[PDB]
Amino acid sequence: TPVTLAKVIKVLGRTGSRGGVTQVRVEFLEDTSRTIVRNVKGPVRENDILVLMESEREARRLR
Amino acid sequence: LISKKRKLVADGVFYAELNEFFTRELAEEGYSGVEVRVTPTKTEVIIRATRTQDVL
Amino acid sequence: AVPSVQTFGKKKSATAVAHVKAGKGLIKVNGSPITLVEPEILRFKVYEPLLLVGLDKFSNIDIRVRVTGGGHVSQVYAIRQAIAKGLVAYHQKYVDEQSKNELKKAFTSYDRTLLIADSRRPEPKKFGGKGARSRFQKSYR
Amino acid sequence: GRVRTKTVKRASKALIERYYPKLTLDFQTNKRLCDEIATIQSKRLRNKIAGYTTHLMKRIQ
Amino acid sequence: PGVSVRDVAAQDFINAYASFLQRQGKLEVPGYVDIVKTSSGNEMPPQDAEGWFYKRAASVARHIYMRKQVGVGKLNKLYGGAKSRGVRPYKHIDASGSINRKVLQALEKIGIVEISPKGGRRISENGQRDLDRIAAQTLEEDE
Amino acid sequence: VLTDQNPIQVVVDAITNTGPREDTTRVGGGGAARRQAVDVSPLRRVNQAIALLTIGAREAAFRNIKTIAETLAEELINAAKGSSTSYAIKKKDELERVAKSNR
Amino acid sequence: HPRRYGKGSRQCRVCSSHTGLIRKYGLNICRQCFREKANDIGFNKFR
Amino acid sequence: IKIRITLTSTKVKQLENVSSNIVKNAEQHNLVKKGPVRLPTKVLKISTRKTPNGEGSKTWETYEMRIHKRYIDLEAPVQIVKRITQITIEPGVDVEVVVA
Amino acid sequence: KKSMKDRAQHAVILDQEKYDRILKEVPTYRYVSVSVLVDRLKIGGSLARIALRHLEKEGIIKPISKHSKQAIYTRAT
Amino acid sequence: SLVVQEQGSFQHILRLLNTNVDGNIKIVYALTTIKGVGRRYSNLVCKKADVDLHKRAGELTQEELERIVQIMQNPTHYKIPAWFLNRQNDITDGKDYHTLANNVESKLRDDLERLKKIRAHRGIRHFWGLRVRGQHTKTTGRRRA
RNA sequence: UUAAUUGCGAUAACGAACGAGACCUUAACCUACUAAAUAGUGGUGCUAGCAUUUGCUGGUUAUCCACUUCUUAGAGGGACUAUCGGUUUCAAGCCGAUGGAAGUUUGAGGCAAUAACAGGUCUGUGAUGCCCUUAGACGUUCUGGGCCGCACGCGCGCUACACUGACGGAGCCAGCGAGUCUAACCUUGGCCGAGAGGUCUUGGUAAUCUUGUGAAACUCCGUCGUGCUGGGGAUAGAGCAUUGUAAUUAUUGCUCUUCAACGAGGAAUUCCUAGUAAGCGCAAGUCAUCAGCUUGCGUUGAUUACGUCCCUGCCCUUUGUACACAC
């Protein structure tokens, strides 16, 4: 199961029409100082640790 | 003799009965209020009105 | 005279007055000792205040607690605060400070309700509903 | 909604423009001093007027 | 250092005392043995048909020394229980008066307790030395 | 008694194993509904992980002679070691392939 | 007049109505006159 | 002569004025006594519907009586049954004089 | 489909033809309890309790920790 | 800690009181199968016959079942306080009787046939099949006819 | 920015008012004051026992002594968002940490602005205008039925659909309230009866007596077994009592027997962010008797949110209107 470790620092805001999805800024531990935008379901804030199945994607907003 | 609870609601409805009755025939005599005072051996009732000598 | 102090505890409907005095070191509630208050699981829960520093503090101290009211788990939740508060009162009445400050910080740094009474009281029920925050079925067309 | 209202605001700057060099950054003696100023009815409102008055007194420093 | 019932568990004490009356001492014979429900909310007689009485005596004797002044009417609500009143929700139903009266009268001549004034029954010395000595032996039966 | 290691470390390992990492969302679209898949916060990971074991053993012990005492016990070891037979792992891969299809 | 009653033949004290009575509290009156009387029963009205 | 004075009044500010006053009168001379006991407030619960008819929501109200009662106990010979019976009564205050 | 059930046949009265195998088939079992006896040895829950008590009388297994409607067991190791 | 041998005397089928009785289960609850005897009365007869309670119905001898069922015909002779019988103070006889498994429906048929000849309110609707106990059937019990 | 025209600030506006806020009550803390056999606590006396060796458990109002921490509210104090670091013309305002009773206006309620409904009520009023009747009166009242009736459709509700269970024995803990005088209420204790229930007395006009309402949900010992079966008691039959002048279309309670559908309910829909929902019981309203309802109280007591306007609705601003009894 190829997974990548993901580090979050900043948070954008809660997105989605239902409001159950949050726009969160997330970085990468391996090859740090690289910015990729990703979505999340559960409540998030600064200084959390997340795992992503895939690393090459970009979703701006969701409904 | 009777319970104090039944006593303090009996004089209440007693006061309600009197307050209603004064306004029935003394309405045109400037009724303001009626106060009841509980005392041993004597009961004190005072009516607040304007034309005192007319009802005297 | 006799060296004795008394404390008390709280719960939803349970109060736990505790009598603490210097003697042969006995523990009992309602005439029954600590190992019989019948939670049968929370037996360790009520052991908690008097175990995390050992039995050296209860060598020659009799404590007796009387409990009245509250549910079974509420009843069990009452003795632990009474004995812990009685433990503090004994520390505040007979023994020195260097033992006292270590005892209290071990109590507070682990669990709050050992010395902190719970202020989360039930909310009164409201009209038009079975519960405090419940409403009846509307069933319109 | 922890937002102040003009009821405590009208009394506050009125206290400052006339009774400034009486109070201090302190809180509870500000509550006690409020008794020594024009009478105020509710003690609950006294908890807020004392809390507000020191709030401006942090800003002025 | 002196052991009472309060210093021992409730279940093992009333079991040891029940075995004491099972083996030694005759409590009484109720007459309506294992044909009653021992209450009104229940519909099944006790499974321990040959017993349910000397352990009944042990429980009431322990509690009549636990409590101070209670009567058979109080005993009915002490050992009552919810009754499945058909479709209606469960409601508390008091225990049978005759059963509690019979065991109390069974144990009056035994001496376990004596009649008290102002209502209820108060424990006699003859009936509490044995009620307290049994606790002094029941805690050592494990070893 | 079985797998004599610490049970609390086994259930922790089971939580890590059975915790889903990504899940799909709901998108209006208009007329028809579509699902978009993004990642799941670790707080939601553990909170969903405990539930999956809970309602995976409820029906397993429901209407059966087997009690709930060992039904939870067998479910947590199966999730921890990995068996692809218990309800928790089956649902975990079901949502993984659901998110994979709508990735 | 031939009459039996004696089984709840109680009317309103102030309006003589055999409708819903509160009773068992010393008032034995109807709900509406209980409403439009004021300052006699439960006047405090803190709650 | 065990003279006991019992007070029953609704207005909480009023019987306290009476209770403080009788204590002051009983404080004169010596007239040993005990302080004012605080018995629980007997709150009365009357519950009525706001709407007279069935139209409208199921709106409910609870009108309450807050009666406060506080008695005192006095023990002294025959002078005090004459020097205490002086009634300091006010509207809304009821007194019950019981001896022995 | 909801077809006819198997009518499980957990033992309710012991007998020699099936009493003998418990001492020979239960061995080599790492984890034992009352529940595993019901669904594998096809015996009753109450029957399991007495049989395990009889089997533990021979000094092979011990209750360790037990309570109402539950028990834990382990063979001689 | 009792061990009992189960020889060939065990049978999977029973036949008592001209009715089918199932075995392989507890005899106390196996007697409830036969109609006309409930759970309460079942344990009274079981303990009055001085038989074991936890023995199964299949492993049962003729003498024990005969002793159990000979109570049913004339229980009053066997020192019962006589308040469990289903037929007490009957109109025809006035004595206390316990109708067996086959007289239960014969008795109520006689009870129903005398209600019908008398044409009482409780009998006309019973012939009609409607409610006779006063229970409401305007909105409840629709799906029974 | 705030739940809030709630505040900052801008500004042909200034000065204002109502509502909200403010205010009050309840639930919270006080080992700080007055305290209190109609609540208690400890000890001194009498007395009972267990090992007697040091203690423990008790009972006792005329055996007293000291106190109000636990029980009761009086005057009162107590958190106002108080500190840091972040964010903001760096103003209002928001978030994370330490004492604790409290950092979703501490929680929940009461009161609750102008105007309107042609919303309900003449079946509450000895308050009613008009029409009708006014004496074989639509007035009062007496007797017996009716509002309970089913070919049926719907709305709030309870038992459920069994193993986190059913049944029977042990531990078995709360709060709110009510209770008789010229009447008959709550009923304690003893005795009798399986049970309901019956008799003789006792205590109370009430923190004192009912009542520690010893309640249930709850846990400990056993039986049962995955079986429309021990789940379930609809359905009926017979017998035992209570209420009442009378209870039959069983008022209601108790006993035995008969033991049906119901096996987690399809469109759709209802309530809910903490002691909350839900599970469970208690007091009161209707009552001479009868809770499956409601009003209050108490026990156990979850997961899931800290967001949005997508559906269903609301407020402010702009635009459009052939609407205005107004989509």
Swiss-Prot record, chain A:
One Pfam family linked to the record? Ribosomal_S28e
A single BP term in Gene Ontology = translation
Compartment list: Cytoplasm
One annotated Gene Ontology cellular component of this protein = cytosolic small ribosomal subunit
Q: Which GO terms describe its molecular function?
A: structural constituent of ribosome
List the keywords (alphabetical).
Acetylation, Cytoplasm, Ribonucleoprotein, Ribosomal protein
**What top-level branch of life does the organism fall under?**
Eukaryota
Q: How is it modified after translation?
A: N-terminally acetylated by acetyltransferase NatB.
Q: What else is known?
A: Present with 94500 molecules/cell in log phase SD medium.
**What is the annotated quaternary arrangement, including any partners?**
Component of the small ribosomal subunit (SSU). Mature yeast ribosomes consist of a small (40S) and a large (60S) subunit. The 40S small subunit contains 1 molecule of ribosomal RNA (18S rRNA) and 33 different proteins (encoded by 57 genes). The large 60S subunit contains 3 rRNA molecules (25S, 5.8S and 5S rRNA) and 46 different proteins (encoded by 81 genes).
Q: What role is this protein assigned? A: Component of the ribosome, a large ribonucleoprotein complex responsible for the synthesis of proteins in the cell. The small ribosomal subunit (SSU) binds messenger RNAs (mRNAs) and translates the encoded message by selecting cognate aminoacyl-transfer RNA (tRNA) molecules. The large subunit (LSU) contains the ribosomal catalytic site termed the peptidyl transferase center (PTC), which catalyzes the formation of peptide bonds, thereby polymerizing the amino acids delivered by tRNAs into a polypeptide chain.
What family is this protein classified in? Belongs to the eukaryotic ribosomal protein eS28 family.
State what protein this is by name. Small ribosomal subunit protein eS28A
From Swiss-Prot, chain B:
Which GO molecular function terms does the record list?
A: DNA-(apurinic or apyrimidinic site) endonuclease activity; RNA binding; structural constituent of ribosome
**What family does this chain come from, according to its entry?**
Belongs to the universal ribosomal protein uS3 family.
Signal peptide extent: none
Could you share any additional remarks the record makes about this protein? Present with 146000 molecules/cell in log phase SD medium.
GO cellular component annotations of the record: 90S preribosome; cytoplasm; cytosol; cytosolic small ribosomal subunit; nucleus; preribosome, small subunit precursor
Q: Which GO terms describe its biological process?
A: cytoplasmic translation; maintenance of translational fidelity; nonfunctional rRNA decay; ribosomal small subunit export from nucleus; ribosomal subunit export from nucleus
Provide the assembly information.
Answer: Component of the small ribosomal subunit (SSU). Mature yeast ribosomes consist of a small (40S) and a large (60S) subunit. The 40S small subunit contains 1 molecule of ribosomal RNA (18S rRNA) and 33 different proteins (encoded by 57 genes). The large 60S subunit contains 3 rRNA molecules (25S, 5.8S and 5S rRNA) and 46 different proteins (encoded by 81 genes).
Tell me the protein's name: Small ribosomal subunit protein uS3
List the taxonomic lineage. Answer: Eukaryota, Fungi, Dikarya, Ascomycota, Saccharomycotina
Q: Which organism does this record belong to? A: Saccharomyces cerevisiae (strain ATCC 204508 / S288c) (Baker's yeast)
In the record, Phosphothreonine modifications are located at: T41
User: Which of UniProt's keywords are assigned here?
Assistant: Cytoplasm, Isopeptide bond, Methylation, Phosphoprotein, Ribonucleoprotein, Ribosomal protein, RNA-binding, Ubl conjugation
Primary localization class, coarse? cytoplasm
Q: Which residues form a coiled coil?
A: none
Q: Where in the cell is it found?
A: Cytoplasm
UniProtKB/Swiss-Prot annotation, chain C:
Where are stretches of biased composition, namely Basic residues?
A: 132-141
Which biological processes are named by the entry's GO terms?
Answer: maturation of SSU-rRNA from tricistronic rRNA transcript (SSU-rRNA, 5.8S rRNA, LSU-rRNA); translational initiation
Top-level division of the source organism's lineage = Eukaryota
Q: What quaternary arrangement does the UniProt entry report?
A: Component of the small ribosomal subunit (SSU). Mature yeast ribosomes consist of a small (40S) and a large (60S) subunit. The 40S small subunit contains 1 molecule of ribosomal RNA (18S rRNA) and 33 different proteins (encoded by 57 genes). The large 60S subunit contains 3 rRNA molecules (25S, 5.8S and 5S rRNA) and 46 different proteins (encoded by 81 genes).
- Provide the species name: Saccharomyces cerevisiae (strain ATCC 204508 / S288c) (Baker's yeast)
Tell me what else is known. Answer: Present with 33800 molecules/cell in log phase SD medium. There are 2 genes for uS9 in yeast.
Q: Which residues carry this modification: Phosphothreonine?
A: T68
GO MF, one example: structural constituent of ribosome
Locate the region Disordered. Answer: 121-141
Family from the record: Belongs to the universal ribosomal protein uS9 family.
> Would you tell me the protein name for this molecule?
Small ribosomal subunit protein uS9A
Q: Which UniProt keywords apply?
A: Acetylation, Cytoplasm, Isopeptide bond, Phosphoprotein, Ribonucleoprotein, Ribosomal protein, Ubl conjugation
> Among the entry's GO cellular component annotations, what is one?
cytosolic small ribosomal subunit
From Swiss-Prot, chain H:
Where is this protein primarily located?
cytoplasm
Cellular location of this protein?
Answer: Cytoplasm
User: In its UniProt record, which GO terms are filed under biological process?
Assistant: cytoplasmic translation; maturation of SSU-rRNA from tricistronic rRNA transcript (SSU-rRNA, 5.8S rRNA, LSU-rRNA)
- The record places the cross-link (Glycyl lysine isopeptide (Lys-Gly) (interchain with G-Cter in ubiquitin)) at K2, K13, K82
* Keyword Iron among UniProt keywords: no
Q: How is it modified after translation?
A: N-terminally acetylated by acetyltransferase NatA. Also partially acetylated by NatC.
One GO molecular function term of this record is: structural constituent of ribosome
Please report any disulfide bonds recorded for this protein chain, giving both cysteine positions.
none
Query: Could you state one GO cellular component term attached to this entry?
Result: cytosolic small ribosomal subunit
Q: Which UniProt keywords apply?
A: Acetylation, Cytoplasm, Isopeptide bond, Ribonucleoprotein, Ribosomal protein, Ubl conjugation
Tell me, how does this one assemble? Component of the small ribosomal subunit (SSU). Mature yeast ribosomes consist of a small (40S) and a large (60S) subunit. The 40S small subunit contains 1 molecule of ribosomal RNA (18S rRNA) and 33 different proteins (encoded by 57 genes). The large 60S subunit contains 3 rRNA molecules (25S, 5.8S and 5S rRNA) and 46 different proteins (encoded by 81 genes).
Q: Which family does it belong to?
A: Belongs to the universal ribosomal protein uS10 family.
Q: What is this protein called?
A: Small ribosomal subunit protein uS10
Lineage in the entry?
A: Eukaryota, Fungi, Dikarya, Ascomycota, Saccharomycotina
Q: Which gene encodes it?
A: RPS20
Q: Which stretch of the intact protein is present?
A: 20 to 119 of 121
